[PDB]
């Protein structure tokens, strides 16, 4: 299985550049509003908003947490059906990396439990957005702001609220220690089972609390009830109860794979969600 | 550093659904021609027996009217009475083994996902394709010019995939029949592994570097032993920009790879991988890192 991004065309049509003084970054143009990181300012006639080479006149503005909302005099005719959503650690999304308002590439990312993403961003990438697409509706979840000294990345939702304990200052910040996304590893184990790779199944089970206590001792995220629910479809498809798969993973954590492989790998993958596995296996 | 696909907007505007009888798959709508896999009709006798009205072409909700049809190898060409306004500047190209491209996976004319693939030395690709994905295309983008190089036709019993260029000629020994087909034995794209090692350095991973250099002939001896493709002097040149930026000569990186092949990774990772990755070309690395 492979990391698959959503097609980026609905988001491509919304990317513009925003310039204040000599500082240029990316903005997101939906109807007659352009959203961009507020630090571009580091009056209406001080903002140069361009779609390609064409200027969009700014007629008003305001700040919502760490994002600037620029009111423009043209409604984007390419505006898709969309929502702003705040995602949870473990959830995945596509990133359209942009420079000077021009799309450069698309790739799939996961929100780490410490609210960073392992992205691929260069100078001028701020304002690039992350998103999911469900039945032609684009759910925008991420706007890019920062690269940590460790090389991972940090940003906000489209309401300007950072994910994690970060601030939009030119200061070296540190993420909390990362953990493994348990729910995604389990989805990966279900994907193995769906494809016939099932030697790791055992005849034990566990309670959720007992498993969560053990997981935390291996730097694994505890499972939420929401996690148990989104594993539901894969449990039903394979006939393997979620708590039985937890007991199989626990043995894997306590004994290892020997030299054995799962899905042709010796390392457990944790950036595929239960939805990604359903998306891909069907 | 991530596996990065080209933005797919330009190609999404070209995807349509083609239906003939019981069979449905995807087509590519360029100006006033729809290109799709010919097996949608299931030979020359078979096409003759068909008429323009046997073909149902849908661009979203709108039906397009077919006014002509011809066959070019394994690709069917349907002239339609309407030109696609979203037709980008484009060209049809046949890629070389080792080269990469983005795949826009589509189902029923609707784009579904985008990911990066490489043409394997044995002329397969390791894709992610389900029932209904035939007609999906692979492409590269250069300055608003889309170069189409792949149209999807089949999945081998081993799970890898096979297809044609846009002139309808298969990559590799495959045919568009309902048969179990094996590919030749695959090899690893050496020049791409080196590109990726350079990328791991540019991104701060250095544990695999060593003080040794090798010769090109001696490195190729070891490569051939481990089922790696030969490294040519043209490959050394193409790696010039990455060696220049890191200050590590190509033959020095080759000595690091040789040691990696002979000793293994010893349970360490490179760019989070436990395997030597070979589906990044030198240009891919340069495009992403600069
Ligand atoms: C946006 O492009 C900026 O508008 C840029 C994106 C990063 C550049 C390299 N890769 C990226 O993802 N963002 C920044 O430069 C931000 C700007 C802030 C929010 C005002 N700053 C950082 O990412 C930043 C600053 C510092 C730092 O200081 C001193 C020390 C260490 C790391 C660091 N990152
Ligand atoms: C197309 O979408 C057909 O329109 C379909 C795509 C594959 C199905 C599952 N995943 C895919 O990538 N392609 C096929 O079904 C083709 C059709 C041919 C070219 C007419 N056939 C195969 O991919 C195929 C057939 C057989 C087979 O038989 C016998 C035995 C083993 C493997 C196999 N693959």
Residue spans of the domains in chain A: they are: 13-72, 182-281
Task: Give me the count of residues in chain B.
Answer: 290
B179 lines ligand 2 (CB under 6 A): yes
Structure solved via:
X-ray
Closest CA to B34 of B51, B49, B19: B19
Contact A130, A154 (CB under 8 A): no
Q: Do A2 and B111 touch (CB under 8 A)?
A: no
CB A282 less than 6 A from any atom of ligand 1 = no
Q: What's the token pair of residue B54?
A: 């046997």
Q: Return the sign of the alpha-carbon dihedral for residues A258, A263, A265, A267.
A: negative
CB B239 within 8 A of CB B250: yes
Residues 6 or more apart whose CB falls under 8 angstroms from that of A226 comprise: A88
Top CATH class of A182-281 equals mainly alpha
CB burial string A96-117: b at 16+ within 10 A, e below:
bbbbebebbbbbbbbbbbbbbb
| Residues facing residue A192 across a β-bridge | none
What's the CA gap between B143 and B13, in Å, rounded?
17
Do A26 and A36 form a contact (C-beta atoms < 8 A)?
Answer: yes
DSSP 8-state code for residue B103: E
SS3 call for B224? helix
Among residues B185, B188, B132, B186, which one has the least CA distance to residue B155?
A: B132
Q: Which 3 state secondary structure label does DSSP give B59?
A: strand
Could you tell me if A26 and A126 are in contact, meaning their C-beta atoms sit under 8 angstroms apart?
Answer: yes
Rounded to whole angstroms, how far apart are CA atoms A163 and A119?
14
* CB within 8 Å of A269: residues ≥ 6 apart: A184, A185, A188, A263
What's the gap in Å between the CA of B92 and the closest CA on chain A? 21
Ligand 2 mean position, distance from CA B25 (Å): 12
For the segment(s) B14-80, the CATH number from 3.40.50.1010, 2.40.10.10, 3.50.50.60, 3.30.360.10 is 2.40.10.10
State the Cα–Cα distance between residues A276 and A254, nearest whole angstrom. Answer: 27
Tell the residue number behind the tokens 């493709």, with chain if given. B229
- The torsion angles phi and psi of B249, rounded to 5 degrees, stand at -70, 155
Q: What angle do CA A224, A90, A106 make, to 5 degrees?
A: 160
B contacts of A103 (beta carbons < 8 Å): 7, 9
B44 vs chain A: nearest CA distance in angstroms?
Answer: 35
E strand or H helix at A238: helix A232-238
Ligand 2 site-directed mutation target among B154, B157, B162, B163, most atoms within 8 Å of CB: B154
Q: Does residue B22 line the site of ligand 2, with CB under 6 A?
A: no
Distance B23 CA to ligand 2 centre (A): 13
- A13-72: what fold? Thrombin, subunit H (2.40.10)
Resolution in A: 1.9
Asked if A138 contacts A131 with a C-beta cutoff of 8 angstroms, the reply is yes
Say whether B36 sits in a helix, a strand or coil. Answer: strand
**CA-to-CA distance for B185 and B13, rounded, in angstroms?**
37
Burial (CB count within 10 angstroms: exposed 0-12, middle 13-18, buried 19+), residue B244: exposed
Buried/exposed B18-39: b ≥16 CB within 10 Å, e otherwise? bbbeeebbbbbbbebbbbbbbb
Residues in chain B whose Cβ is within 8 Å of chain A: 1-10, 12-13, 104-105, 111-115, 126-128, 130, 203-204, 269, 272, 274-275, 287-290
Per DSSP, the three-state class of B220 is helix
Ligand 2 atom nearest the C-alpha of B155 is 23
Decide: B171 and B164 in contact? Cβ < 8 Å. Answer: yes
Place of tokens 């990696």: B260
For residue A267, count other CB atoms closer than 10 A to its CB: 14
Residue B52 CB neighbours (<10 A): 13
What is the distance between the alpha carbons of residues A145 and A168, in angstroms, rounded to a whole number? 7
Atom 16 of ligand 2: nearest residue by CA position: B154
Per DSSP bridges, beta strands A82-84 and A137-147 are parallel
**A280 min Cα distance to partner chain B (Å):** 8
Q: Do B274 and A282 touch (CB under 8 A)?
A: no
> DSSP letter string over A179-215?
-B-HHHHHHHHHHHHHTT--TT--S----HHHHHHHH
Name the phi and psi angles at B198, rounded to 5.
-60, -35
**Which run of H or of E encompasses B287?**
helix B282-289
Residues whose CB is less than 8 angstroms from the CB of residue B143 and which lie 6 or more positions away in sequence, other chains included: none
Q: What is the 3-state secondary structure (H, E, C) of B109-169?
A: CEEEEEEEEECCCCCCECCCCCCCCCCCEEEEEECCEEEEEEEEEEECCCCCEEEECCCCC
- CA dist A239 and B64 (Å) reads 45
Q: Which fold has domain B190-289?
A: main proteinase (3clpro) structure, domain 3 (1.10.1840)
| Tokens describing residue B41 | 């009709």
CB within 8 A of B46, min separation 6: which ones? none
Distance CA A49, CA A93 (A): 26
Helix, strand and coil in chain B, % to nearest 5: 25, 30, 45
**Residues of chain B with C-beta less than 8 angstroms from the C-beta of A53:** none
């Amino acid at each position: 299985f492979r990391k698959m991004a959503f097609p980026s065309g609905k988001v491509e049509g919304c990317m513009v550049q925003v310039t204040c003084g000599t500082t240029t970054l990316n903005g997101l143009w939906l109807d007659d509003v352009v959203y961009c990181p507020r630090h571009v300012i580091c009056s209406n006639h001080n903002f140069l908003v361009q779609a390609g080479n064409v200027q969009l006149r700014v007629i008003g503005h305001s700040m919502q947490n760490c994002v600037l909302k620029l009111k423009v005099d043209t409604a984007n005719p390419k505006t898709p059906k969309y929502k702003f959503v705040r995602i949870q650690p473990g959830q995945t999304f596509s990133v359209l990396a942009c420079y000077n308002g021009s799309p450069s590439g698309v790739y799939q990312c996961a929100m780490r439990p410490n609210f960073t993403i392992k992205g691929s961003f260069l100078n001028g990438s701020c304002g690039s957005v992350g998103f999911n697409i469900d039945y032609d509706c684009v759910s925008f979840c991420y706007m890019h702001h920062m690269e940590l000294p460790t090389g991972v990345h940090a940003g906000t939702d489209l309401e300007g609220n950072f994910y994690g304990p970060f601030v939009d200052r030119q200061t070296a910040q540190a993420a909390g220690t990362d953990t493994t996304i348990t729910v995604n590893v389990l989805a990966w184990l279900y994907a193995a089972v769906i494809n016939g790779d099932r030697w790791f199944l055992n005849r034990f089970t566990t309670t959720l609390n007992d498993f969560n206590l053990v997981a935390m001792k291996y730097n694994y995220e505890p499972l939420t009830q929401d996690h148990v629910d989104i594993l539901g479809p894969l449990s039903a498809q394979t006939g393997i109860a979620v708590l039985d798969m937890c007991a199989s993973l626990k043995e894997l954590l306590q004994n290892g794979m020997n030299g054995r492989t799962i899905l042709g790998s010796a390392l457990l993958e944790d950036e595929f969600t239960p939805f990604d596995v359903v998306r891909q296996c069907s």
